[PDB]
């Protein structure tokens, strides 16, 4: 049965497509025809954080919206007090080719990972007034691209070996492994209820996983190139992605099909980061054009720019209360916009 | 294992759905209920937006030393050069100069750093390097067409538009044996070798034809921003570290001409 089983593949692929054909009875771009436009969004810079001496790759806020952490290729991790631009902690690493870092929900640990195939955990508030390592997680065969905390004892990781993994920090072993993609995995986004998460891969497909069971549930398509960024909507029922064909797309969970695409004929570069707002009316994205764009998520029209950098951005973030926006770039500066 | 994908396809096909006419009017009703709490849409008063004590001063005095330590270590790390070592296999890339690996050496009091990542995505990290090293086997006539295309896939990259390339044609001692034995015909793989002539004759005419194929892909489309430097290596050679330094002098001299605008 070399090709006999391959017959049912096309049958199922054309059957689920036909089953999705029925659900498209209208478009999001149709009912949003009568709504107040956002208008010009004019934002200015408030703080500039200097101190890094190389390219900057990742950034993550804290749960109190005051403390934050940043990572750059000089080999350092730095924690910032964003109200007075003070440095609270500065941590030196063992490898310098890092690509991701994370902030812990409680405020006691940070996590870091890069081209060395290991995820590191660092303990912040410990007697003796030092900062040292807690546990090192090994078991991936490719490089690390993302990581996120659930509790003080569980972390999820995404690698370039086409798999995802869930860990237990106390024991130090990979308890659950998620397989099913074809190319490298670049993005990761946890759900607010922390019971599911979506993933983005280097082959233009996005899958939805289940943490307790351990298998896929849904797979989405419609990009023509690799996906670089993905993030969950505040509501928790939808998500957005960003690729190299200069386009951003909004999918759906209970309808299994996409809803909106954000394109412009003057844009020719690829998206590198994306992030939603607190209410879910604005959608901020970063480009290789050395600036960020602010799209209206409900009308797909543009509503502003943030042109304060002189290289590509590569990071983005919004606070939990939605006060300020933080951006890094390859020119070694952090900027706070409001 | 062909049934594994079909099982997942069957598990995916059986799912409940709702129509988009209700799956989008629900996303529309979430913002109108939370519209008056997003500060980035409704500007907050100028006196409430968050963007010294005896302890706040000690905090700043603490923060003022990290800066000097960071700047001291960075200025010290400013010095050295950094190289990237590519090459697929069968070549001996790990035996030319005597996760991720690293290697150090120095000649004439200048330190070099060589990396070997043991590539379409992680190549952005090595965007500010001095030069890339490419190694090829010059005694394996079947993989040459693979090496020729790998070289052109590297030379025409998007992030490597201004990075020069050094090139070593390895294992030249085997090529002399293979060509003087006479049991192998080079035209059996490249028909255009029958017309070529040189501008030990049978080995020289053979190796220059091999070099020309790479130099043609090199000089095809470069626009004079970066160039390629070819060399002939062997299995045992002690004078291989001087060539990289003598070629980085020429990469830096040709780089200073374009900042001070003398060209």
């Amino acid at each position, epitope marked *: 049965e070399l090709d006999q089983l391959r017959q049912e593949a096309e049958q199922l692929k054309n059957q689920i497509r036909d089953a999705r054909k029925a659900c498209a009875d209208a478009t999001l771009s149709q009912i949003t025809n009568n709504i107040d436009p956002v208008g010009r969004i004019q934002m200015r810079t408030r703080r500039t954080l200097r101190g890094h001496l190389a390219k900057i790759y990742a950034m993550h806020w804290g749960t109190d919206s005051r403390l934050l952490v940043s990572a750059s290729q000089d080999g350092k991790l730095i924690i910032w007090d964003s109200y007075t631009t003070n440095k609270v902690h500065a941590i030196p690493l063992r490898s310098s080719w890092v690509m991701t870092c994370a902030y812990a929900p409680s405020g006691n640990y940070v996590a870091c990972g890069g081209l060395d195939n290991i995820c590191s955990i660092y303990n912040l508030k410990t*007697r003796e007034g*030092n900062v040292r390592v807690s546990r090192e997680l090994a078991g991936h065969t490719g490089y690390l691209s993302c990581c996120r905390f659930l509790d003080d004892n569980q972390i999820v990781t995404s690698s370039g070996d086409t798999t995802c993994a869930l860990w237990d920090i106390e024991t130090g072993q990979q308890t659950t492994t998620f397989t099913g993609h074809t190319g490298d995995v670049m993005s990761l986004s946890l759900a607010p209820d922390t019971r599911l998460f979506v993933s983005g891969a280097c082959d233009a497909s996005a899958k939805l996983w289940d943490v307790r069971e351990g298998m896929c549930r849904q797979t989405f398509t419609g990009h023509e190139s690799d996906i670089n960024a993905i993030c969950f909507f505040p509501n928790g029922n939808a998500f957005a992605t960003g690729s190299d064909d200069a386009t951003c797309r909004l999918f759906d969970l209970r309808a299994d099909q996409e809803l909106m695409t954000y394109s412009h004929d003057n844009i020719i570069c690829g998206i590198t980061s994306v992030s939603f707002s607190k209410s879910g009316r604005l959608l901020l994205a970063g480009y290789d054009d050395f600036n960020c764009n602010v799209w209206d998520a409900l009308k797909a029209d543009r509503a502003g720019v943030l042109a304060g950098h002189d290289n590509r951005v590569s990071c983005l973030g919004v606070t939990d209360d939605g006060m300020a926006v933080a951006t890094g770039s390859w020119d070694s500066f952090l900027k706070i916009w409001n | 294992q062909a049934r594994k994908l079909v099982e997942q396809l069957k598990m995916e096909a059986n799912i409940d759905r709702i129509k988009v006419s209700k799956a989008a009017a629900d996303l529309m009703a979430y913002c109108e209920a939370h519209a008056k709490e997003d500060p980035l849409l409704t500007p907050v008063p100028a006196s409430e937006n968050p963007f010294v004590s*005896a*302890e*706040d001063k000690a905090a700043a005095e603490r923060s003022k030393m990290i800066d000097k330590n960071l700047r001291e270590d960075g200025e010290k790390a400013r010095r050295t050069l950094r190289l990237l070592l590519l090459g697929a296999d069968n070549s001996g890339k790990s035996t030319i100069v005597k996760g991720i690996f690293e290697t150090k050496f120095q000649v004439d009091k200048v330190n070099f750093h060589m990396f070997d990542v043991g590539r379409r995505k992680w190549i952005q990290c090595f965007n500010d390097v001095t030069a890339i090293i490419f190694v090829v086997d010059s005694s394996d006539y079947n993989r040459l067409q693979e090496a020729l295309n790998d070289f052109k896939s590297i030379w025409n990259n998007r992030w490597l538009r201004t990075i020069s390339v050094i090139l070593f044609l390895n294992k030249q001692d085997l090529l002399a044996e293979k060509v003087l034995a006479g049991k192998s015909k080079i035209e059996d793989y490249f028909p255009e070798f029958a017309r070529y002539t040189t501008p030990d004759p049978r080995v020289t005419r053979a190796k220059y034809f091999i070099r020309k194929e790479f130099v043609d892909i090199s000089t095809a489309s470069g626009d004079g921003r970066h160039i390629c430097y070819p060399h002939f290596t062997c299995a045992v050679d002690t004078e291989n570290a001087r060539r990289i330094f003598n070629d980085c002098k020429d990469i830096i001299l040709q780089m200073n001409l374009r900042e001070y605008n003398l060209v």
Partner: single-chain antibody
Amino acid sequence: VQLVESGGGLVQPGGSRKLSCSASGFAFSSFGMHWVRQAPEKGLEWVAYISSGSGTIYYADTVKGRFTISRDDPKNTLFLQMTSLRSEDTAMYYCVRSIYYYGSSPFDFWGQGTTLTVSSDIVMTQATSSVPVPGESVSISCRSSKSLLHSNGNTYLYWFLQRPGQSPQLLIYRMSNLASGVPDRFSGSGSGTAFTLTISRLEAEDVGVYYCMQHLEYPLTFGAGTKLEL
């Protein structure tokens, strides 16, 4: 963590002395330092302060001029030199560590003191002097001259505890936060100039004198003490 002090003895007036404190168990070169004394039958009193890196020093006006403070990092030692002493310089001397960044807690670990026999500024008021005390909830209070509430939102009032024959301890820092190693029976509250420490579910080993302290501006003024008896 350990901080042991030395020096002491019997001395006649018009003399001099040197005190040393040795530390073992932490990153000494990133903490501030304080010396604090206590008369034979009185409360606590602040003496000197040296910062981290030896870049900011503060003395007490009562002893300014003849005292000196100096630290030696690679040997992990703290030094205090006293000259031209008097009869009011008979007391027990301690050593205290502190650290300052966003979210920290200073004054947390005290040491073992030494004795030496030699034969505007805010004031804190500890109203009560003794209270009989079991499992009975109690309450204590402190009051200041001006309101310690700053424009940052902070409030700089500390609570300590001295059991008989021991060093003091930290319970609450900045009027509302519970330290590490402390049970949840103790709690804190208050407002501007109106504070109250609410100990609930009283148990044993909770007997001793209690003090309040301030940190809003130098100098650092302790209190007179509220004692609890069974």
